[PDB]
Design a protein around this nucleic acid. Structure first.
Lengths: 121, 114, 56, 209, 120
RNA sequence: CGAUGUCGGCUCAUCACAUCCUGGGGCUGAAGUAGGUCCCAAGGGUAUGGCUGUUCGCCAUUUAAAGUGGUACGCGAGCUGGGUUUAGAACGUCGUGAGACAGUUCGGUCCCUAUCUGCCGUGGGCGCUGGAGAACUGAGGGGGGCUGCUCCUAGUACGAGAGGACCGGAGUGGACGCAUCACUGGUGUUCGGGUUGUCAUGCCAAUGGCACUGCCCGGUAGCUAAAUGCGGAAGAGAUAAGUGCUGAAAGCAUCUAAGCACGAAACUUGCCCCGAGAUGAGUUCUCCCUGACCCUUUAAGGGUCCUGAAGGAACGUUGAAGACGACGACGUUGAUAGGCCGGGUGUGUAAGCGCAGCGAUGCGUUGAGCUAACCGGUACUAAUGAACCGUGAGGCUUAACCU
RNA sequence: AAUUCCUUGUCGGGUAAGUUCCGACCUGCACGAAUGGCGUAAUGAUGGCCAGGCUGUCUCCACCCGAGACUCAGUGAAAU
RNA sequence: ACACAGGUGGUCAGGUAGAGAAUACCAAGGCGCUUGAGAGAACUCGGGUGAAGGAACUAGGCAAAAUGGUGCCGUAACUUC
RNA sequence: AGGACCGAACCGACUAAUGUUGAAAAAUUAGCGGAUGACUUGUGGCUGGGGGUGAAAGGCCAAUCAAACCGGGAGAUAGCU
């Protein structure tokens, strides 16, 4: 949601915890919602996966502790923010399997193909 | 006021079931994708505000895929269409926020007035 | 935080123009006993308007 | 177009059939009564003077009582005036006033803001406090430099300092009407509206519309 | 600033305000007439009238409540036995404030506050 | 030199254009896309980090863009005190030494109650020509003036292909601003509950005091952003650079000499706010006062008697109004505040009794007691009747009408 | 290097990014052996760097509790 | 200098909880600190609590926040053992 | 046993904030170091100014120290204000 925020990773190839270092779009954009694309660095990584510790790349958030506000006035909030890793050039997901619930607000463009792999929408 | 809540009296549902915090209620909610629409289910332990009138809230907590999800509901919304009791739970508090952060600890069941 | 020049007696009196006290201009004689008292107050003979509300 | 005058009641939500749940500000509007009609011969501008309310007839003075008794009588809580451009109106009162806001889509709400009183720089303008910890003797929320040394030698007129915030007319534009109802005597507009509850509002059809 | 807020701070902290109004309510219930500063008298009537209304209906729990606030058994007995049995036909308004002159040390607007039905 | 505080940072700015973006144009070795260069334009906008005391600079990642310069290299009676520049101590170098160095390293007191101007907000007096209550006109003055991405037009024009538009529409964002509390939340030492140590209320029970509100768990009204609505345009007039029409001086040509016609976020308007002390003191509507004398220079008044109007004020009950004034509601023809009653809300099954259990404790009564600033009513209490201020028809000259 | 002017020397580590840190090389402007050289467990309100926990330091401030400021009555200074 | 938040040697030493002369409430005893009364602005002083993030602040984690007892389990490089 | 460990009285004075015409001519608050010793303290005595004393800073010698205070040479001298 902010620069210097550690986030977990909801996909398999993206590994462990990432810290997001720029909220993309906007002149002075302080905050990132659920749908928004951010720039991360990989602080912790599993040994097997295609990512490694210390590389810059993009991600889309999928979960927030602040949560997302539905039109009826209701809000769905989680315990732990999470992100799904995306490639820097093309913004498609690196991973194959998305873990954890992923909200309904990312029905646009490539986040649809994230949704199809997501377990609960 | 007199004049406020006359507009709310027609708006509130008369079919809201009786609930208390501590119960494992189940909420069916309208989800639309295209022109077609579908009911989605949601079941979990409730941390509900008592009604402030037409404005009302039922915070229901459920751990689904290993991530805890707390989603509030306007009780008188058209999006929510059915709320069911399922389990009947007994706790001393009105708000169970302190009992929301622990993992794998469940509220007990009492037979009467709960 | 200090003055560079001394204020004149004219400037001092001009500032002292606004703080002059006001007379009350109205004293109500009480109904039961003919005592001039301040409005909405006890006449200190024990009386409000109707009666001797306090013995002292 | 003339815009009727009302009194703020509170805020409510209206659930749509879809479920969009828009905010609604309920503006109670009594039947406005036209007291005096102004035309170019009497004074070079066109307007209607409108009263709305019901005063107790002990607080009305005789100068207001004679002006009320002229041209159709009703004691009211005050007098307002709306300029008019394309139409013509009577000197008597009108019967139902919300039905001319019935056809309109976007309104323009005017009212007095709530009195925040003597409010400082950080609350009045979106100023930044100085730092809380690293030193900062007696200068956390204080205004900084109010000027530019000797070459100006003075403080410019637009300089933002601490003062009164509130109790001024503030106008919200292009506000969208939700519904009207003459029998409930109400005008329902989406979202936030200036005013404390119980304050008088001047809703007009929108100039930007 | 303050908007729709009630209660007078009286230049005190909350423990001292509660202790003052306990003692002031006790003295008014006992002597049936006391002399106070005016805002102290206004807040005092806002404290005293609920205890008299609570004294109107007698039970063990009501006596325990009116001992929890105003913390003296003799004032409890005097209230529950003879202050409220007199105000049983009266619906509210058990106190009357009479403004006086200013006190000599500091200009304080001083006022008696008295019960409406006085034993004296 | 009987003292004008020194780099940088924080807070707050204001100006110039030699313009970084956005706006308009000329040429192009401008096919398009994207450039290059030059003219016009100052309305708005113009990053966040790593390092270093740094300005600067490099680097990462953004952006439409991360402008250049003045303002005591803006701002220390606004802040910091890292750098520099006191006294201690040390290294390298110099000197026999005391000591020294734009070298280097660790540590090193930053005062002020605002008189005047200047701004930011609020009153008191007087004026405006009889005196009052309101509602306005607008000479002026301020605020605002930013813009990304996607989709259609359109895979059209152009282009061998690769690629990929002009114009015009439609959505959805980023920073900024105004308002507000219906929602999401924060606070809510004035509401409820749990609990530790101790002291008291004669002791059990139940409570109160104190230990930061003793520690916590929630939370009403209000204030509030992180929440939620809206907003910087549409469109006119006159233009800058430019592009022109007609047309001579100069039979041709020529945007100009005459006449005419376009053209930008700049100018004047359009939007929001103040605003008749606008002494040039404006307009409209309503209300109220039309009695006796006396003396005196009679460029005119002064005094006495009678009468005090409309209305204002003072006092009180007060307010989502407020530092104090002020502004607004009410004063017994009364809902202005406190209490009362009813609801709501918030805690979460009070107390008392009985049952079960050895006991801790549980169960029934019972969603029970308590409930704030909330909502709807209700004269129970305080808003006393007087009293105060303001008068008695409102100057002269001239012009039109009536008489 | 508490000693390096050139100098933010060059390479490696740490970080998305490191004029400081750590390990190296040696071109030591201008280390060096009781004016002591190099190392060193324990110790230090000692200097420089890093990580975890934690948070209003911060993004970005919001409310609340008290003492002044504000008003009233009394006394009543100061530099200039 | 002052009816001044400073300095001043020795003696005694009750309870509950506690290792204790710490600390919390208290006995015996002594005080309420020689201006008060209102209202509840900005701003300052001392505190309390904060959604999401967690040092992005800064010269610097300065200040705050955290941590803390008793018993048992367990405990690394290095070392002058 | 220990110039041993934790920690009150006691001695000290590293940090920040408040005060800076102060409550105080060096302090208050929240942390901080030593705490059986090269400790800390009461009463008295000794060292006297080119002198003393100094676990050494130009430190201390009565709110004064790279030469105390008080009186005298003394109306030092002042090409300076």
């Amino acid at each position: 949601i902010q620069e210097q925020t550690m986030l977990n990773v909801a996909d398999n190839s993206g590994a462990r915890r990432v810290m997001c270092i720029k909220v993309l779009g906007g002149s002075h954009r302080r905050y990132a919602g659920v749908g928004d694309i951010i720039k991360i660095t990989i602080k912790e990584a599993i040994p097997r996966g295609k990512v490694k510790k210390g590389d810059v790349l993009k991600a889309v958030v999928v979960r927030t502790k602040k949560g997302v506000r539905r039109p009826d006035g209701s809000v769905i909030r989680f315990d732990g923010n999470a992100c799904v890793l995306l490639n820097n050039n093309s913004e498609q997901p690196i991973g194959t399997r998305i873990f954890g619930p992923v909200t309904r607000e990312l029905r646009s463009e490539k986040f649809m193909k994230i949704i199809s792999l997501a377990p609960e929408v | 006021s007199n004049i406020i809540k006359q507009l709310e009296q027609e708006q509130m549902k008369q079919d809201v079931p009786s609930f208390r915090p501590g119960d494992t209620v189940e909420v069916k909610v309208w989800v639309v994708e295209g022109s077609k629409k579908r009911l989605q289910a949601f079941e979990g332990v409730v941390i509900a505000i008592r009604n402030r009138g037409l404005h009302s809230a039922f915070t229901v907590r459920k751990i689904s895929n290993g991530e805890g999800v707390e989603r509030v509901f306007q009780t008188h919304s058209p999006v929510v269409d059915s709320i069911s009791v399922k389990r009947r739970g007994a706790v001393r508090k009105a708000k169970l926020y302190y009992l929301r952060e622990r993992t794998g600890k469940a509220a007990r069941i009492k037979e009467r007035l709960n | 935080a200090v003055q560079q020049n001394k204020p004149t007696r004219s400037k001092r009196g001009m500032r002292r123009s606004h703080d002059a006290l006001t007379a009350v201009t109205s004293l109500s004689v009480d109904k039961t006993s003919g005592e001039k008292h301040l409005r909405h107050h006890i006449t200190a003979d024990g009386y409000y308007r109707g009666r001797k509300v306090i013995a002292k | 177009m003339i815009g009727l005058v009302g009194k703020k009641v509170g805020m409510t939500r209206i659930f749509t059939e879809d479920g969009v749940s828009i905010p609604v500000t309920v503006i109670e509007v009594e039947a406005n009564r036209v007291t005096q009609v102004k035309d170019l011969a009497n004074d070079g501008y066109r307007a209607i003077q409108v009263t709305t309310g019901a005063k107790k007839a002990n607080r009305v003075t005789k100068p207001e009582a004679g002006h009320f008794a002229k041209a159709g009588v009703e004691a009211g809580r005050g007098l307002w005036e709306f300029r008019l451009a394309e139409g013509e109106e009577f000197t008597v009162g009108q019967s139902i006033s919300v039905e001319l806001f019935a056809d309109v889509k976007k309104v323009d709400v005017t009212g007095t803001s709530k009195g925040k009183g003597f409010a400082g720089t950080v609350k009045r303008w979106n100023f930044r406090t100085q730092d809380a910890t690293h030193g900062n003797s007696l200068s956390h929320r204080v205004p900084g430099s109010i000027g530019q040394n000797q070459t100006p030698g003075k403080v410019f007129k637009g300089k933002k300092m601490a003062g009164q915030m509130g109790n001024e007319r503030v106008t919200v534009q292009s506000l969208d009407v939700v519904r009207v109802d003459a029998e409930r005597n109400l005008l329902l507009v989406k979202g936030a509206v200036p005013g404390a509850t119980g304050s008088d509002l001047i809703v007009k059809p929108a100039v930007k519309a | 600033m303050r908007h729709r807020k009630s209660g007078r701070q009286l230049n005190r902290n909350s423990s001292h305000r509660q202790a003052m109004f306990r003692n002031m309510a006790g003295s008014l219930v006992r002597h049936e007439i006391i002399k106070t500063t005016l805002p102290k008298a206004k807040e005092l009537r806002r404290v005293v009238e609920p205890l008299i209304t609570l004294a109107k209906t007698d039970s063990v729990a009501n006596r325990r409540l009116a001992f929890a606030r105003t913390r003296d058994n003799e004032i409890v007995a005097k209230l529950f036995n003879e202050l409220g049995p007199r105000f049983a036909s009266r619906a509210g308004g058990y106190t009357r404030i009479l403004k006086c002159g200013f006190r000599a040390g500091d200009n304080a607007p001083m006022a008696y506050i008295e019960l409406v039905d006085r034993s004296e």
